[PDB]
Amino acid sequence: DTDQLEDLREHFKNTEEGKALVHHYEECAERVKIQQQQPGYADLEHKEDCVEEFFHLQHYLDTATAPRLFDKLK
Amino acid sequence: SSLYKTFFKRNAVFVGTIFAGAFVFQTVFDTAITSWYENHNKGKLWKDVKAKI
Amino acid sequence: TEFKAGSAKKGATLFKTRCLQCHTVEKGGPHKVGPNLHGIFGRHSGQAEGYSYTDANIKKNVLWDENNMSEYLTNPKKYIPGTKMAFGGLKKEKDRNDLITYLKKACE
Amino acid sequence: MTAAEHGLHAPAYAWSHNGPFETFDHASIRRGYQVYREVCAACHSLDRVA
Amino acid sequence: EQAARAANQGALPPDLSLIVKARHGGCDYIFSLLTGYPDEPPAGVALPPGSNYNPYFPGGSIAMARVLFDDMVEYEDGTPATTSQMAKDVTTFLNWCAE
Numbered sequence: 001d002t003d004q005l006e007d008l009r010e011h012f013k014n015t016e017e018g019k020a021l022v023h024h025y026e027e028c029a030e031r032v033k034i035q036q037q038q039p040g041y042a043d044l045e046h047k048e049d050c051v052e053e054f055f056h057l058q059h060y061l062d063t064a065t066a067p068r069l070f071d072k073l074k
Numbered sequence: 075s076s077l078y079k080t081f082f083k084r085n086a087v088f089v090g091t092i093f094a095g096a097f098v099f100q101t102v103f104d105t106a107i108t109s110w111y112e113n114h115n116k117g118k119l120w121k122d123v124k125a126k127i
Numbered sequence: 128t129e130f131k132a133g134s135a136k137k138g139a140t141l142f143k144t145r146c147l148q149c150h151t152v153e154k155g156g157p158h159k160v161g162p163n164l165h166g167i168f169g170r171h172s173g174q175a176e177g178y179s180y181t182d183a184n185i186k187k188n189v190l191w192d193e194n195n196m197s198e199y200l201t202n203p204k205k206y207i208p209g210t211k212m213a214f215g216g217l218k219k220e221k222d223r224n225d226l227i228t229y230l231k232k233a234c235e
Numbered sequence: 236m237t238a239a240e241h242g243l244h245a246p247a248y249a250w251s252h253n254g255p256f257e258t259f260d261h262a263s264i265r266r267g268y269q270v271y272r273e274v275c276a277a278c279h280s281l282d283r284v285a
Numbered sequence: 286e287q288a289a290r291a292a293n294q295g296a297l298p299p300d301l302s303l304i305v306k307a308r309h310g311g312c313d314y315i316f317s318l319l320t321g322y323p324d325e326p327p328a329g330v331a332l333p334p335g336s337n338y339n340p341y342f343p344g345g346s347i348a349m350a351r352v353l354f355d356d357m358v359e360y361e362d363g364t365p366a367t368t369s370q371m372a373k374d375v376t377t378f379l380n381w382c383a384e
């Protein structure tokens with residue numbers, strides 16, 4: 001059977017806040033992918049990561065799923 | 075309350091009567107809480123699990 | 128014959144998620160928690176050099192093939208009660224097919 | 236301290252044992268044992284449990 | 286401990302006997318950890334070889350990899366052993382173990 005936490009993470013990934021949040025996250029990943037090709041990324045000591053945005057996304061879904069999840073579980 | 079004056083009649087409750095009730099209470103009160111507690115948690119307890127086994 | 132050819136794309140990820148974090152499929156001998164598996168089919172159990180297999184793996188001397196592989200993966204611990212392999216196994220038959228089917232297009 | 240170092244804050248799932256009147260769900264316990272024995276017990280000791 | 290550290294690439298699996306009480310969040314943290322494994326670390330995360338990204342773990346780099354997958358266990362009582370259903374069950378057992 002399909003995992004209950006995944007089914008819910010998916011339904012909430014596709015809501016207004018959900019799509020907005022994943023967008024900001026994806027606009028970040030796309031910004032980093034560029035830097036990695038660019039001249040001397042290995043040497044830069046400034047390298048941006050998208051954790052902050054992954055956190056806002058993840059946090060949002062947690063808030064949405066957490067109080068619901070256990071009703072679906074045994 | 076005149077319900078008091080029927081038992082102790084204008085006197086305080088004596089130490090012997092007190093101690094005596096302490097024993098009775100102790101036993102009753104427990105069965106009561108245990109019963110309410112076990113009931114409120116039906117299905118989660120081991121006894122409940124053992125039946126379904 | 129209790130083996131059907133599933134997909135090498137499903138097995139790639141079935142491996143990635145549940146085997147990769149201990150095993151390496153490419154040529155050579157890069158041993159991790161488990162020994163690297165390049166040329167494990169047709170080979171005996173516990174041969175790959177540079178690795179210290181348990182007494183149990185060598186002892187059974189299993190000739191590796193699709194049908195033994197599918198019976199080991201059912202329960203790696205029931206097959207050889209002394210294997211240091213921390214793995215419960217693939218309960219579903221279809222999944223062992225797709226998995227082993229990937230190992231032919233990889234450990235070759 | 237950076238959000239990542241602290242680590243993401245785990246949300247609060249509605250556990251059946253959370254509550255001044257709630258006992259653990261022993262059936263869930265039993266299942267958990269099995270999960271530990273078949274999955275975790277290959278790397279995790281449980282030294283304090285006789 | 287050496288045998289243990291050897292079998293886990295230098296890392297050492299803590300004894301689970303009191304893990305629920307030995308962490309913040311307890312049941313919640315334990316559970317969110319077992320489930321919290323994304324398939325890919327967020328963009329830009331340089332992950333040390335032999336490490337796995339989990340957001341709920343301080344620092345993001347935990348030596349334990351995802352181990353809970355759907356149906357990998359056949360619950361004697363019938364219950365569908367989904368990854369989050371299994372997570373819920375050990376955590377409740379681990380909570381008992383500790384308390």
Ligand code: HEC
Binds near residue numbers: 173
């Ligand atoms: C690390 C936790 C592992 C995971 C997950 C997988 N394997 Fe493994 N494997 C591991 C160890 C520690 C060992 C050695 C055990 C021993 O008895 O010495 C093994 C061994 C095997 C073998 C035997 C190799 C031989 O030459 O006979 C096989 C066939 C094997 N492992 C396959 C395998 C695959 C493809 C996996 C995913 C289903 C897998 N292992 C994961 C450690 C770990």
Ligand code: HEC
Binds near residue numbers: 278293298
């Ligand atoms: C060996 C393959 C493991 C299996 C199977 C499971 N765990 Fe594990 N665990 C393992 C390691 C190497 C570590 C240490 C990682 C580190 O960086 O410290 C752990 C750690 C944990 C912890 C505590 C982590 C922490 O917060 O510091 C927990 C909460 C934990 N493991 C739980 C757990 C459970 C319940 C498992 C079965 C479902 C399980 N682990 C399996 C290695 C392995």
